[PDB]
């Protein structure tokens, strides 16, 4: 049953904290470096950042030391919130499952 | 800055699963009830999955059985993938790091 969605569900989240790698960067960039922080959003734009892959690909080809940054932060990014995931989505179904079900149920009355 | 990034990507999860779940009843249903199944895709096509609580409210006017085999399923397959799925996605991340590093690597020589 699991396995086969379990990898499916795995890639979407790489790609998912890939884009929220780029998006803590963008914001540190905004400050820190305004011209590097426009030139990744204009990339973004020529790049659908959902391709993870492809998008950092064609990005080694512009700026190396962006991706290099990107690399970095999501794996770092990644554990940090793994840890917890489980925990929450799980809870965060459950009560959205009871809300539902009891929405529906008064929603009749 | 783990906490807000976390909270966000459980979000987008419990999302993601409630599309599986969908994903998986259509499967089934294309056996034992063909006509479910058909009317099951349809929905999903005026109804953008990608906004699980409005899209589960919506159902709840056009069919209650299978909303509520929506909701005890996708639970369910997050029981089944969950656990397992901080363990795949940082293999996945250090992986990906690496071919990219590494086809840095092959670049600058």
């Known amino acids: 049953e699991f396995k086969k969605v379990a990898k499916e569900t ?3 989240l790489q790609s998912y904290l ?3 790698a780029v998006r803590l ?4 960039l905004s400050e820190t470096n305004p011209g590097q922080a426009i030139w ?13 892959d492809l998008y950092l690909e064609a990005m080694m080809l512009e700026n190396k030391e ?15 919130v793994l840890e917890f995931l489980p925990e929450m ?3 965060q179904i459950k009560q959205s499952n009871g809300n539902h079900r009891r929405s529906l149920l008064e929603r009749l009355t």
Do not use: D, M
């Open 18 to 20: 890939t884009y929220q």
């Open 25 to 28: 960067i963008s914001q540190q």
């Open 66 to 80: 962006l991706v290099l940054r990107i690399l970095t932060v999501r794996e770092n990014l990644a554990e940090g």
């Open 10 to 12: 795995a890639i979407t």
């Open 89 to 91: 989505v799980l809870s």
């Open 40 to 52: 990744l959003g204009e990339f973004s734009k020529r790049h659908p950042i959902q391709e993870s």
